[PDB]
Amino acid sequence: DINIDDILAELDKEVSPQQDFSDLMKSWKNERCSP
Amino acid sequence: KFRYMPFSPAGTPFGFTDRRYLTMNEVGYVSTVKNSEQYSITVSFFDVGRFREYHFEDLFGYDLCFLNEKGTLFGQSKTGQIQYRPHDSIHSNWTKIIPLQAGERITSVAATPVRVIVGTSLGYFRSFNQFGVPFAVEKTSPIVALTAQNYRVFSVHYSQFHGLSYSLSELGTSSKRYYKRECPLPMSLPNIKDANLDYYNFNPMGIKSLFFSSYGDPCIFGSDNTLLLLSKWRSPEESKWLPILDSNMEIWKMSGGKETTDIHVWPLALAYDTLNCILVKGKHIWPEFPLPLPSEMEIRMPVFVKSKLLEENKEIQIPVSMAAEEEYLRSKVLSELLTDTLENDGEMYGNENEVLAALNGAYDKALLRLFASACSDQNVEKALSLAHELKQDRALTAAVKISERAELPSLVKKINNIREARYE
Amino acid sequence: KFRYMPFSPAGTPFGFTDRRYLTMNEVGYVSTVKNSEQYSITVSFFDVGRFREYHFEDLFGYDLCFLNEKGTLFGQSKTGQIQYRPHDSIHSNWTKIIPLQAGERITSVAATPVRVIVGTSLGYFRSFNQFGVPFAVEKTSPIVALTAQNYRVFSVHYSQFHGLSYSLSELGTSSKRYYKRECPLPMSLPNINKDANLDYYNFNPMGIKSLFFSSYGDPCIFGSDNTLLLLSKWRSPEESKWLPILDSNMEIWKMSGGKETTDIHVWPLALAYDTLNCILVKGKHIWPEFPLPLPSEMEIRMPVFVKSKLLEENEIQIPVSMAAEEEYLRSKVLSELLTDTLENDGEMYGNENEVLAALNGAYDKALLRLFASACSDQNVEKALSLAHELKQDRALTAAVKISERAELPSLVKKINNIREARYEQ
Amino acid sequence: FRYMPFSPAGTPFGFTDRRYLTMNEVGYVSTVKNSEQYSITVSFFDVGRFREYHFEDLFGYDLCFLNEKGTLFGQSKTGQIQYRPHDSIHSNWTKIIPLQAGERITSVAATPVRVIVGTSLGYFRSFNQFGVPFAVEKTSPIVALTAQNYRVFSVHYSQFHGLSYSLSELGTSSKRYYKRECPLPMSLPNKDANLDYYNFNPMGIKSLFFSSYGDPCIFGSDNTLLLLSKWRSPEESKWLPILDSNMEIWKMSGGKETTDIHVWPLALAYDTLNCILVKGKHIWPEFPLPLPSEMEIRMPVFVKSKLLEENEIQIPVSMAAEEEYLRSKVLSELLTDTLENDGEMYGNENEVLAALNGAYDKALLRLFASACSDQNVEKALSLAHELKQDRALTAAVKISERAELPSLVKKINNIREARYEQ
């Protein structure tokens, strides 16, 4: 059948403290393990 | 031949053990232990913030119970003793004996914020206010099962001379209203392994539980293990029972098929769109005392041809056509129920309008996904009739885009006529 | 396998006795004697001061009858002959034959000043003016009992495929209205599974002893449980509900001093306001004999009482609080029934306003005795609920006084808040 | 209970390779045992509007409904359905419906708008005319279905609900149930030629259809046509046994209690029932399908004993007058109800209603003359109160003058005054 998932995507499209904490976790892990 | 038995919602038998549940619902659960010649009753709550558990030694051996937010109602079916227990204990407990003829029993009990209700096997129907004052006595078909939520009371009747029927009421502090009286109930009764026979000895009607949605719509879960919800009950000329969840099919599906048996659904409450229930495993159909966590099943409209799924799957996955059918139907019925609640009862958490808007989004998306397959079979009229169903005009533009990609200029033309009409 | 039988209100078996009744009523009674295998019918009255007794040979074998104020209606269940006989003879008697399909019976008949009605074991509902012209034909579930008053008709239906149910209707001038329409009836059939009882239920398997409209037009019925059921608020279908306003077994148990006697039974004639007019049968057979007792009375009484309490605390005497429970509920239902009658039909007897005032007095007085029963135990919340149920201002200040002598100042304030909310209107 | 499938006026095989699935105003459907395969034929009574066709069927369709726009087919046990428009420009479509363990499809129906399927477990499934599923509902177990335009009429039965029916209309805003599983006053069947049929149709519902004027009808094991009058107002609805075909066949048999003549109902159209007159041992039509025929509607007021005492059968005029007054009254009420709610379907009903009210008063005048000939004042005066037209009241005045009964003359003149002074 005709796929329409991109049509449905253009229908569906109609900084945060959590991101900062996740970035801190990434930085902490990379720092701890890197030389 | 038939025998009346006491019922309480989702209560269990003793079986081969010395403790059982009297009831369980969205508020909590009650259990009783055969402590030699007397009974140890424990009342337990799911919201430990609002309510605190308690227990007491029971010398009468209550076999009926009901549990709302405000208090617990108890009854002893064979002696006519009943007791009511407010949960604050700033209002007093009280006890009463209601009269029984020889061989008559209390079959069910329920309570509301301003009333206590008792139904017997000879169909007397006795109302007391919440402080025990007698207020009325009716006679009806015998009330085999009975519950309430806030001021709304929903009762199921049966006799050999009347058949299965139900009543729905909204008793209130004032404007005491009756929506339907002893209308026939389309539920299926059990057929005439021994754990099943033991359960039906305990509960011949085979009603596993009976309750309201969180938005206040009647529900019942019969011997077919199919959750029924009464839609549009607020206007009796349009009311209809919807089979919102065939739990046998959903258990079969989620287990990958394979004739899966010895797992059973024990319903507690529906909430919005998701049955809270205990998934009991093993030979016995009913839960054990260390009450398992009530697992969650989202409702599923019964459009799943088992043979088709067997051919596809031979872990089970659903063809997108069948999935879009179920999505369209489920979103439509849930949106109708939300619309009726918001028109009549109004918002209670203050986000139901956003939920209903998102739900209409799912509805239109399901219609577009069906429309695409209709266009893939190049049926202009099936496509157009599907196009008529969409709610959002902006979503109806996507049908134009699809029918362009499916090379149906006739469909594009017709849809633009619908656009021009919908512009009004 | 079921067998239909002809029925009429308060009719009886023969048994092994050749004298039998076809019906009994507040107006009178009808009986037959099978002389030489024809039937000398006797029509008799309880208010002979305005009606003559009369007597004739029925050669057709009428087994159905319905006596009313204006005349009597007879019917023969098998051949389908029906006959109407007014009480004066300025109006003519008349006779007609009704069609019977194969294996059918006429099962019951009824009459009014403005209508005649017939029902059959295949559910044909056939109705006429009072002169025998067929004004309508209709099909229902099989009719097994039937009664009427003025424009109003109440009928009971049964089959293996429909279950016990009733219909209530009225001839409006424009069209016939059904208030209730083969709705399930909460009466109990007899236990089919003692020999005199078996004889009666062979005569009448449905177990209905009588069914009639009240003196105020409410439908009433009386079955194998020997309770009297009245359909309250029949004037509004969605909220109409059956009230078991009397249990005759309980009242017989009381009047016989708690003795479980087998030898007294109540035979219903008609309900008039607070009292069932009835014939108290005695002995082995559970229906009246040829010399009728006088039309006796019982007061209606709501079944709030329980034997296990009256046995210990009581020819049976009743504790005051429980007596007040009965009086309160009876005053409540009677007040509602007369209020609905006054609103819907007006005064049928020209004094119901004063009866209603008396009922309001009894209502509030029973509530005040319950108020004292609550303040006795300092149950403030129960007392205040009762205070909301009280309706006349005199009783509200009486409740203040009872609160004062029981020292509930909280109730003094709260009752006076109820008063203030009311008298300011 | 058994729950065998139903279709309007279908017939059993009866140790024969041919049977009918459906019969209607438009036509009939039949099937042949073609070894394990089945041949199916779709045939029409209006071969001017429609054309017959065949197809070979490996599923074994045993449910069918024959709507003027198209034929709907169904397989009871496998749960497959198929819709075949007669204007074959529109595509066929197929749907396999979910059937639970031990369930069957028990009935199907079709309309210009909506398609309906019902099952032995009481599932009630709806589709648009192109196969899109629009709704699912649960009722008590469906045993029969029929439909017309937006209006649907269904019968239900179980050991736990009793024989009952629902009447419904899909309004464009919302569906309305006019009556909903109300108890149905039809008699179930109470030898072997009858038993071979009741093993195929245990409810004994020979057919289930709407009138030409859109009023529900059912034809039961008692061989009476029941029509539900004033269904548009459930406060007042009445099942009328408008025709007893046993009585009419007995009358046409000259008073003989014939075992060898039977009727198969197709459809009511005003004062007549389209039906097929089958004869002989079997009570259902046979392979060489006899022609459609019209019985008049005649209400069961005839007394058998009195008629054979009077006596083809000839009726005494007073009894005939009772029947014609009664039937004209009910048909007049049905025409007023349909005209007020739905208007003229055929551009003819207003004039027919005027003629019909004429028949009503004329039958009453025959009764009034009969009563006056007996010198019965009270019966005649009551009969005069029924008269609908002033021509009839003036005629009654002159009839009572002719009967030398001036009390009626004066009282009826005052009734006439009370009418015309308004």
**DSSP letters along B18-64, please?**
SEEEEEE-SSEEEEEEEETTEEEEEEEES-TTT---EEEEESS---E
Decide: C157 and C142 in contact? Cβ < 8 Å: yes
Q: Is B113 on the interface with C (CB under 8 A)?
A: no
Nearest Cα to C332, choosing from D244, D365, B138?
A: B138
CA atoms D331, D332, D338, D344: torsion sign: positive
Structure tokens at B74: 């108890």
Which residues of chain B neighbour C306 with C-beta distances below 8 Å? 80, 97-100
Alpha helices in B230-277 (DSSP H): 247-254
Nearest to B133 by CA among C243, C372, C386: C386
Give chain C positions within 8 Å (CB) of D190: 103
Distance CA(C365)–CA(D276), nearest Å, equals 74
The answer to whether B26 touches B46, Cβ cutoff 8 Å, is yes
Tokens of D250: 């007995």
Q: Which residues pair with D266 in a beta bridge?
A: none
Asked whether the beta carbons of B365 and A8 are under 8 A apart, the reply is yes
Q: Residue A13's beta-bridge partner residues?
A: none
CB neighbours of B324 closer than 8 A, spacing ≥ 6?
B366, B369, B370, B373
Categorise residue C14: left if φ over 0, alpha if ψ from -120 to 50, beta otherwise. alpha
User: What distance in Å separates the CA atoms of residue D406 and residue D167, rounded to the nearest whole number?
Assistant: 51
How far is the alpha carbon of C357 from chain D, nearest alpha carbon, in Å? Answer: 35
Name the residue with tokens 């198209």: D70
From CA B202, how far away is CA B225, in angstroms rounded? 17
Q: Rounded distance, CA C382 to CA B116, Å?
A: 14
B108: amino acid identity, one letter: S
State how far Cα B174 lies from the chain centre. 27
Q: Which helix (H) or strand (E) holds C344?
A: helix C320-344
Nearest to B188 by CA among D99, D121, D101: D121
User: Cα separation of D150 and D170, whole Å?
Assistant: 5
> E strands, B177-302, where?
177-184, 209-212, 218-221, 226-231, 240-246, 263-269, 274-281, 295-298
Whether the Cβ atoms of residue B185 and residue B206 lie closer than 8 Å to each other: no
**SS3 at position C220:** strand
**Strands of B263-269's sheet in order across:** B263-269, B274-281, B295-298
- Give buried/exposed letters for D133-159 (b at 16+ CB in 10 A, else e): bbbbbbbbbbbbbbbbebbbbbbbbbe
Whether the Cβ atoms of residue C113 and residue C27 lie closer than 8 Å to each other: no
For B228, name the nearest residue in chain D, comparing CA atoms only: D138
Identity of the amino acid at D3? Y
**CA nearest to B349, candidates B334, B340, B338:** B338
Other Cβ atoms closer than 10 A to D89: 5
What are the tokens at B29? 């659960």
Burial zone of B297 (CB within 10 Å; 0-12 exposed, 13-18 middle, 19+ buried): buried
Q: Left (φ > 0), alpha (ψ -120 to 50) or beta: where does C364 sit?
A: alpha
Note every long-range contact of D222-229, with CB atoms under 8 Å and residues 24 or more positions apart, other chains counting: D222/C101, D222/C122, D222/D186, D222/D187, D222/D246, D223/D262, D223/D263, D224/D300, D225/D265, D225/D268, D225/D273, D225/D297, D226/C139, D226/D185, D226/D186, D227/D268, D227/D334, D228/D167, D229/D330, D229/D333, D229/D334, D229/D337
CB contact under 8 A, B365 and A11: yes
Q: In sequence order, which residues have a C-beta less than 8 Å from that of residue B357 and are 6 or more positions away? A: none
Q: What contacts B309, CB < 8 A, 6 or more positions away?
A: B253, B257, B316, B318
Write the burial class of residue B306 (CB in 10 Å: 0-12 exposed, 13-18 middle, 19+ buried): middle
Find the distance separating the first CA and the last CA of chain A, reported in whole Å: 54
Under a CB-based contact definition with an 8 Å cutoff, are residues B379 and B330 in contact?
no
Helix, strand, coil share (%) of chain D residues, nearest 5: 25, 35, 40
Q: What are the helix (H) ranges across B70-229?
A: 194-202
- Count other Cβ atoms within 10 Å, centred on residue D39: 15
- The CA dihedral of C17, C18, C22, C26, to the nearest 10 degrees, is -70
* Nearest by CB: C177 against D235, D302, D326: D235
- Residue linked to tokens 């059968």: D313
Instruction: Among B361, B364, B376, select the one facing A2 at the smallest CB separation.
Output: B376
Measure the CA–CA gap between D135 and D126, rounded to whole angstroms: 5
Query: Amino acid letter at C312?
Result: E
Contact present, D236 and D248 (Cβ < 8 Å): no
Name residues whose C-beta falls within 8 Å of residue B73's C-beta, 6 or more positions apart in sequence.
Answer: B65, B66, B67, B82, B83, B84, B85, B109, B110, B111, B116
Residue of B183, B329, B379 lying closest to D136 (CB–CB): B329
Phi and psi at residue C184, to the nearest 5°: -65, 140
Decide if C135 contacts C122 (C-beta within 8 A): no
Cα–Cα distance for residue pair D370/B41, rounded to 1 Å: 81
* d(C-alpha D357, C-alpha D350), whole Å: 11
Residues C349, D303: Cα–Cα separation, whole Å: 44
Q: What is the DSSP string of B88-117?
A: SSSSPPEEEE----TT--EEEEEEETTEEE
What is the three-class DSSP state of D343? Answer: coil
Structure tokens, C147: 């009664």
In whole angstroms, what is the distance from residue D318 CA to residue D322 CA? Answer: 6
Helix axes D349-373, D317-342, angle to 10 degrees: 150
Question: Helices then strands (H, E): number in chain D?
Answer: 8, 23
Query: What chain B residue is nearest to D174 in terms of C-alpha separation?
Result: B238
Q: Mark out chain A residues that contact chain B at CB-CB < 8 A.
A: 1-4, 7-8, 10-12, 14
The pair of three-digit structure tokens given for residue D422, joined into one six-digit string: 């308004």
- Residue B256 burial (10 A CB sphere; 0-12, 13-18, 19+): exposed
The 10 Å CB-count burial string (b at 16+, else e) for B50-62 is ebeeeeeebebbb
With contacts defined as CB-CB under 8 Å, which chain D residues touch B385?
128-130, 132
What lies within 8 Å, CB to CB, of B39 at 6+ separation is B32, B33, B57, B58, B59, B61, B62
The Cα D364–Cα D247 span in angstroms is 23
Q: Find out whether B295 and B279 touch, Cβ atoms under 8 Å.
A: yes
CB B212 within 8 Å of CB B229: no
Q: How far apart, in whole angstroms, are the C-alpha atoms of residue B419 and residue B13?
A: 60
Distances (CA, A) of C341 to C151, D32, D374: 15, 67, 42
Q: Compute the distance between CA of residue B278 and CA of residue B267 in angstroms, rounded to an integer.
A: 7
Residue with tokens 């009630």: D124
- Which residues of chain D come before a gap where C and the next N are over 2.5 Å apart? 190, 311
Neighbours of chain A (3+ CB pairs under 8 A): B
Distance between CA atoms of D218 and B97, rounded to whole angstroms? Answer: 52
Question: How far, rounded to the nearest angstrom, does the alpha carbon of residue D131 sit from its chain's CA centroid?
Answer: 29
| D134's tokens | 């629009």
For chains A and D, tell me whether 3 or more CB atom pairs sit within 8 A of each other.
no
Q: Which residues pair with D240 in a beta bridge?
A: D227
CB atoms within 10 A of CB D92: 14
Judged by CB atoms closer than 8 Å, whether chains meet at B178 and C229 is answered as no
D294 phi and psi angles, rounded to 5 deg: -115, 120
* Cβ-based neighbour number of residue C18 at 10 Å: 11
Instruction: Please state the φ and ψ torsions of residue C40, each to the nearest 5 degrees.
Output: -70, 100
A2 CA: distance to closest CA in chain B (Å): 6
Q: State the maximum Cα–Cα separation within chain A, in Å, rounded to a whole number.
A: 54
**Shortest CA distance to C226 belongs to which of C200, C258, C203?**
C200
Contact by Cβ (8 Å): B291, B29: yes
Residue B57: strand pairing partners: B40
- CB burial of D369-385 (b: ≥16 within 10 Å; e: otherwise) equals bbbbeeebbbbbbbbbe
Of B142, D187, D223, give the one whose Cα is nearest residue C160.
D187
Name the β-bridge partners of C59: none
- The C-alpha atoms of residue C169 and residue C176 are separated, in whole angstroms, by 7
B97 inside 8 A of chain C by CB: yes
Neighbours of chain B (3+ CB pairs under 8 A): A, C, D
At residue C182, what is the residue type?
E
β-sheet bridge partners, residue B110:
B117
Beta bridge partners of D32: D18, D39
Judged by 3 or more CB pairs under 8 A, whether B touches D is: yes
Task: Report whether B208 contacts B316 (CB < 8 A).
Answer: no
State how far the alpha carbon of D343 is from the alpha carbons of D171, D175, D217, D336, D340, in Å.
Answer: 17, 21, 20, 9, 6
Phi and psi angles of residue B257, each rounded to the nearest 5 degrees, phi first: 80, -120
> Which candidate, D192, D187, D229, D193, places its Cα nearest to that of D206?
D187
Give whole-number Cα distances, D378 to B409, C173, D319, D418, in Å.
77, 19, 19, 19
User: By CB neighbour count within 10 A (0-12 exposed, 13-18 middle, 19+ buried), where does C356 fall?
Assistant: middle
A-chain residues near B402 (CB < 8 A): 2, 4, 7
Which chain D residues are Cβ-neighbours of B142 within 8 angstroms?
A: none
Rg (CA), chain D: 24
- CA separation, residue C71 to residues C112, C117, C299 (Å): 8, 14, 29
C and B in touch (3+ CB pairs within 8 angstroms)? yes
Q: How far is CA D105 from CA B227, D13, D94, D98, D417, in A?
A: 21, 19, 15, 10, 62
Chain A residues with beta carbon closer than 8 angstroms to that of B406: 2
Cα dist from C158 to B13, B114, D273, whole Å: 36, 38, 31
| Packing angle, helices B393-405 and B352-376, rounded to 10 | 20
Sign, CA torsion B72/B78/B79/B80:
positive
Q: Is there a contact between D45 and D23 (Cβ–Cβ < 8 Å)?
A: no
Rounded-to-integer distance, Cα B73 and Cα C391, Å: 30
Chains contacting C with at least 3 CB pairs below 8 Å? B, D
For residue B280, list its beta bridge partners.
Answer: B264
Q: Tell me which amino acid residue B227 is.
A: L
SS3 C303: coil
Structure letter (DSSP) for residue D258: -
**Strand pairing class (B28-35; D175-183):** unpaired
At C135, list the tokens: 């004004």
Which of B189, B302, B382 minimises the CB distance to D132? B382
Q: Residue B208, exposed/middle/buried by CB under 10 A (0-12, 13-18, 19+)? A: buried
Cα distance between residue B212 and residue D35, in whole Å: 54
DSSP symbol at B189: P
Give the DSSP H or E segment for C389. helix C380-389
8 A C-beta contact, residue C266 and residue C209: no
DSSP letters along D44-65, please?
ES-TTT---EEEEESS---EEE
Resolution to 1 decimal place, in Å? 3.2
3-state SS string over B354-386? HHHHHHHHHHHHHHHHHHHHHHHCCCHHHHHHH
CA–CA distance, D198 with D4 (Å, rounded to integer): 10
Strands laid side by side in the C176-184 sheet: C143-149, C152-157, C165-171, C176-184
3-state secondary structure of D171: coil
3-state secondary structure of D318: helix
Contacts of D183 in chain C (CB under 8 A): 141, 162, 165, 182
d(CA B68, CA B54): 15
DSSP letter, residue D234: T
